Design an enzyme around this catalytic site. Structure first.
Site, PDB file in Angstrom:
ATOM      1  N   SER A  45      32.611 -27.585  14.889  1.00 22.36           N
ATOM      2  CA  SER A  45      33.044 -26.353  15.520  1.00 22.36           C
ATOM      3  C   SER A  45      32.334 -25.100  15.038  1.00 22.36           C
ATOM      4  O   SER A  45      32.540 -24.017  15.612  1.00 22.36           O
ATOM      5  CB  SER A  45      34.550 -26.163  15.392  1.00 22.36           C
ATOM      6  OG  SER A  45      35.231 -27.186  16.088  1.00 22.36           O
ATOM      7  N   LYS A  48      30.697 -22.816  17.574  1.00 22.51           N
ATOM      8  CA  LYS A  48      31.411 -21.909  18.474  1.00 22.51           C
ATOM      9  C   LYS A  48      31.056 -20.446  18.207  1.00 22.51           C
ATOM     10  O   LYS A  48      31.147 -19.621  19.139  1.00 22.51           O
ATOM     11  CB  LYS A  48      32.922 -22.196  18.369  1.00 22.51           C
ATOM     12  CG  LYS A  48      33.289 -23.549  18.925  1.00 22.51           C
ATOM     13  CD  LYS A  48      34.650 -24.054  18.584  1.00 22.51           C
ATOM     14  CE  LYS A  48      34.910 -25.463  19.091  1.00 22.51           C
ATOM     15  NZ  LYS A  48      36.089 -26.148  18.492  1.00 22.51           N
ATOM     16  N   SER A 105      39.708 -22.492  16.839  1.00 25.06           N
ATOM     17  CA  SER A 105      38.831 -23.623  17.076  1.00 25.06           C
ATOM     18  C   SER A 105      39.146 -24.379  18.357  1.00 25.06           C
ATOM     19  O   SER A 105      38.893 -25.583  18.461  1.00 25.06           O
ATOM     20  CB  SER A 105      38.765 -24.550  15.855  1.00 25.06           C
ATOM     21  OG  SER A 105      37.418 -25.035  15.765  1.00 25.06           O
ATOM     22  N   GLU A 141      32.539 -30.776  23.980  1.00 18.15           N
ATOM     23  CA  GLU A 141      33.700 -31.287  23.285  1.00 18.15           C
ATOM     24  C   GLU A 141      34.310 -32.422  24.082  1.00 18.15           C
ATOM     25  O   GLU A 141      34.510 -32.241  25.302  1.00 18.15           O
ATOM     26  CB  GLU A 141      34.791 -30.207  23.101  1.00 18.15           C
ATOM     27  CG  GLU A 141      34.341 -29.031  22.256  1.00 18.15           C
ATOM     28  CD  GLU A 141      34.221 -29.334  20.793  1.00 18.15           C
ATOM     29  OE1 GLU A 141      34.516 -30.473  20.371  1.00 18.15           O
ATOM     30  OE2 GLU A 141      33.798 -28.390  20.039  1.00 18.15           O
ATOM     31  N   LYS A 209      33.944 -19.425  10.105  1.00 19.52           N
ATOM     32  CA  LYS A 209      34.220 -20.429  11.117  1.00 19.52           C
ATOM     33  C   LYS A 209      34.071 -21.810  10.469  1.00 19.52           C
ATOM     34  O   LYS A 209      33.027 -22.121   9.899  1.00 19.52           O
ATOM     35  CB  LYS A 209      33.278 -20.331  12.325  1.00 19.52           C
ATOM     36  CG  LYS A 209      33.603 -21.369  13.381  1.00 19.52           C
ATOM     37  CD  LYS A 209      34.793 -21.019  14.216  1.00 19.52           C
ATOM     38  CE  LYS A 209      35.375 -22.175  15.003  1.00 19.52           C
ATOM     39  NZ  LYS A 209      36.148 -23.111  14.170  1.00 19.52           N
ATOM     40  N   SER A 210      35.124 -22.599  10.531  1.00 21.98           N
ATOM     41  CA  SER A 210      35.122 -23.957  10.009  1.00 21.98           C
ATOM     42  C   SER A 210      34.735 -24.985  11.055  1.00 21.98           C
ATOM     43  O   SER A 210      34.690 -24.734  12.257  1.00 21.98           O
ATOM     44  CB  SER A 210      36.499 -24.252   9.468  1.00 21.98           C
ATOM     45  OG  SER A 210      37.475 -24.244  10.478  1.00 21.98           O
ATOM     46  N   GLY A 211      34.512 -26.213  10.575  1.00 17.19           N
ATOM     47  CA  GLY A 211      34.322 -27.350  11.432  1.00 17.19           C
ATOM     48  C   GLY A 211      34.850 -28.622  10.786  1.00 17.19           C
ATOM     49  O   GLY A 211      34.831 -28.756   9.553  1.00 17.19           O
ATOM     50  N   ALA A 212      35.269 -29.533  11.641  1.00 17.83           N
ATOM     51  CA  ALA A 212      35.636 -30.882  11.238  1.00 17.83           C
ATOM     52  C   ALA A 212      35.158 -31.832  12.341  1.00 17.83           C
ATOM     53  O   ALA A 212      35.284 -31.525  13.512  1.00 17.83           O
ATOM     54  CB  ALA A 212      37.146 -31.024  11.061  1.00 17.83           C
TER      55      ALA A 212
HETATM   56  C1  LIG Z   1      41.434 -29.955  15.110  1.00 15.05           C
HETATM   57  O1  LIG Z   1      40.465 -30.959  15.344  1.00 15.05           O
HETATM   58  N1  LIG Z   1      39.905 -32.056  14.807  1.00 15.05           N
HETATM   59  C2  LIG Z   1      38.752 -32.164  15.340  1.00 15.05           C
HETATM   60  C3  LIG Z   1      38.053 -31.158  16.214  1.00 15.05           C
HETATM   61  O2  LIG Z   1      37.952 -31.420  17.390  1.00 15.05           O
HETATM   62  N2  LIG Z   1      37.570 -30.121  15.644  1.00 15.05           N
HETATM   63  C4  LIG Z   1      36.861 -29.061  16.364  1.00 15.05           C
HETATM   64  B1  LIG Z   1      36.087 -28.151  15.284  1.00 15.05           B
HETATM   65  O3  LIG Z   1      35.163 -28.917  14.412  1.00 15.05           O
HETATM   66  O4  LIG Z   1      36.991 -27.329  14.443  1.00 15.05           O
HETATM   67  C5  LIG Z   1      38.080 -33.485  15.189  1.00 15.05           C
HETATM   68  C6  LIG Z   1      37.045 -33.918  15.968  1.00 15.05           C
HETATM   69  S1  LIG Z   1      36.591 -35.528  15.551  1.00 15.05           S
HETATM   70  C7  LIG Z   1      37.792 -35.499  14.338  1.00 15.05           C
HETATM   71  N3  LIG Z   1      37.953 -36.611  13.524  1.00 15.05           N
HETATM   72  N4  LIG Z   1      38.508 -34.384  14.234  1.00 15.05           N
END
Ligand SMILES: CO/N=C(\C(=O)NCB(O)O)c1csc(N)n1
Ligand SMILES: [K+]
Ligand SMILES: [K+]
EC number: 3.5.2.6
Length: 263
Positions: A45, A48, A105, A141, A209-212
């Site tokens: 994420s 974004k 996110s 996404e 900005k974080s990501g997962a």
């Molecule tokens: C809250 O989500 N968990 C996610 C996601 O879609 N994150 C979007 B962004 O990187 O903040 C996710 C995607 S695959 C996974 N395991 N968790």
């Protein structure tokens, strides 16, 4: 400071997986410290912010309006859409979508915004045109979070991301008004509390900005500094760990604590 590298390489050990790091002077662009700075990691994420930078570039050019309303359906909702799932009836403006995408996110928000600029290929073109010849977005996404080992789809490097973020936040790329809007969305981040924010001293500024993603991927991009104003950018990514989310979060928070301590 090399003491922060002690913690970064400790993290990579603890996590059983690669960690990428860079600390960049916001004003000068100087690399202060790095680890794996030119290795690729899934953006997740963190893209974004780049997306909403591209949107704001279109606003500045008269190709988009922050108040334009986009209408969408249940048909557009993808996983983890805490804001957009609440506005199916009357839609959301471009501004509202960028707020959702950055602060919360929201994944559907990101897909709707990608659609406005012509999709991943156009975000990548926008990045190349601003001098980022590394970062690429390829998918939408949710699939862009798949984090396949050795896949360059949907990746950046710590160095490429940090210098792109610097250009967006300080460069002539965006008008002052648009640069501040982007900052404001990032300052307003609501879903990054366990990360750098948990190490941030009182009175300091942070815009992040974080990501997962899959396969243990986790990361954060941030502009931060003392007395209410940013002065450095920090980028941290990891992918491949089997560790819990809490474990990943804590390592990032501990990297943050060290870079603060040695500022
Ligand atoms: C809250 O989500 N968990 C996610 C996601 O879609 N994150 C979007 B962004 O990187 O903040 C996710 C995607 S695959 C996974 N395991 N968790
Ligand atoms: K150094
Ligand atoms: K609708």
């Amino acid at each position: 400071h090399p003491e922060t590298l002690v913690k970064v390489k400790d993290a990579e050990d603890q996590l059983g997986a690669r960690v990428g790091y860079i600390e960049l002077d916001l004003n000068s662009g100087k690399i202060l410290e790095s680890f794996r700075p030119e290795e690729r990691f899934p953006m997740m994420s963190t893209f974004k912010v780049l997306l909403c930078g591209a949107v704001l570039s279109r606003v500045d050019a008269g190709q988009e309006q922050l108040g334009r309303r986009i209408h969408y359906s249940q048909n557009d909702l993808v996983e983890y859409s805490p804001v957009t799932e609440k506005h199916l009836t009357d839609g959301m403006t471009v501004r509202e979508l960028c707020s959702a995408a950055i602060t919360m996110s929201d994944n559907t928000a990101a897909n709707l915004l990608l659609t406005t600029i012509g999709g991943p290929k156009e975000l990548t073109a926008f990045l190349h045109n601003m001098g980022d010849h590394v970062t690429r977005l390829d998918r939408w996404e949710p699939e862009l979070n798949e984090a396949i080992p050795n896949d360059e789809r949907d990746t950046t490097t710590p160095a490429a991301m940090a210098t792109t973020l610097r250009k967006l936040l300080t460069g002539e790329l965006l008008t002052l008004a648009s640069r501040q809007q982007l900052i404001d969305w990032m300052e307003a981040d609501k879903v990054a509390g366990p990360l750098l924010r948990s190490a941030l001293p009182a009175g300091w500024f942070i815009a992040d900005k974080s990501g997962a993603g899959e396969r243990g991927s986790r990361g954060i991009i941030a502009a931060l500094g003392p007395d209410g104003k940013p002065s450095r950018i920090v980028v941290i990514y990891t992918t491949g760990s089997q560790a819990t989310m809490d474990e990943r979060n804590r390592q990032i928070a501990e990297i943050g604590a060290s870079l603060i301590k040695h500022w």
